Structure 1
Amino acid sequence: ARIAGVDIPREKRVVISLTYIYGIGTSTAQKILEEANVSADTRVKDLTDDELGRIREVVDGYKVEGDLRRETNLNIKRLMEISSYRGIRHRRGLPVRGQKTKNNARTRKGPVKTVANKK
């Protein structure tokens, strides 16, 4: 469904409506609004069929799709399959660069358990 990809809410404005699609944010959305010449008007999905088709076919322009999730999959999984220290820190909340984990448990691993071996 319905106007593009999957999972759009009805009766919502375009500039936000086209972002629940996994693959678009807020600016590239505005770009595809600039291609098919559509816009909100006003807080709500006014898109009648005559615009629906053009958005329905223009939207193929990008990855958007779950294929982006698979793209991420083979990216990270390749990244650990090869050697690799980058996968080891792909488990540690540490990108190829670094973030200095001492308080970086609660971004990944939900501070529970708390247990301190001081001193």
Structure 2
Amino acid sequence: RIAGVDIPREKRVVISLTYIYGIGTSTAQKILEEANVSADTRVKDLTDDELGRIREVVDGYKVEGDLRRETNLNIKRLMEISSYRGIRHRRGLPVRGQKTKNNARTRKGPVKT
């Protein structure tokens, strides 16, 4: 349990750390190398000192709830300023200049025939 989130017990530590929101493969490897820990050692077969070092490294990465709050604040700011990206966020359409005549499902939800 790191950053207030449990992680799979039987998964290798490097992969299992990615389950923390804000932690991916690259940052997981970087954290594991900073806090010296075997790459292939499973979290279940892990030492308390290693877990503490991992927590110490992780706490400063600005992940999980703080990261979610920051992303939401950015989205809200662009919505509030009345930017084009804000309008498209409000309308639930692609924001990065895609074509909406077709293929905009991940932003527009399921097809309404």
Q: TM-score, normalised by structure 1?
A: 0.80
CA shift digits 1:42-93 (9 cap, x unpaired): 4563212121111121111201121111101110111111122221122456
Alpha-carbon distance in 2 for matches of 1:84, 1:53: 44
**Count of residues in correspondence between the two structures:** 113
Structure of higher CA gyration radius: 1
Residues in 2 aligned to 1:3 and 1:48: alpha-carbon distance in whole angstroms: 14
Which residues of structure 1 form unaligned runs of 5+?
115-119
Equivalent pairs: percent with the same residue?
100
1:46/1:62 Cα in 2 relative to 1: closer, same or farther (>3 Å)?
same
State which drifts further: 40-49 or 75-84. 40-49
Q: What RMSD over aligned residues (CA atoms) do the two structures have, in Å?
A: 2.1
Give 5+ residue unaligned stretches, structure 2: none
SS in 2 for 1:64: coil
Deviation larger for 24-33 or 57-66: 57-66
**Alpha-carbon contact 2:94-2:104 (below 8 Å) kept:** no
Moved more, 14-23 or 99-108: 99-108
Residues 100/93 of structure 1: CA separation in 2 closer, same or farther (3 Å cut): farther
Structure with the largest fraction of helix: 2
Distance in 2 (alpha carbons) for counterparts of 1:104 and 1:44: 41
Q: Is the 8 A contact 1:105 1:111 kept in 2?
A: no
1:97 is aligned to 2:99: no
Indicate how the Cα distance of structure 1 residues 36 and 42 shifts in structure 2: closer, same or farther if over 3 A, else same.
closer
Q: Which residue of 2 aligns with 1:19?
A: 18
- What TM-score do the two structures reach when normalised by structure 2? 0.84
> Cα 1:40–1:113, aligned 2, differ >3 Å: closer, same or farther?
same
1:67/1:3 Cα in 2 relative to 1: closer, same or farther (>3 Å)?
closer
Q: Which residue of the partner structure matches residue 66 of structure 2?
A: 67
Worse-superposed segment, 60-69 or 94-103: 94-103
Q: Is the 8 A contact 1:4 1:56 kept in 2?
A: yes
**Residues 1:84 and 1:44: Cα distance change in structure 2 (over 3 Å):** closer
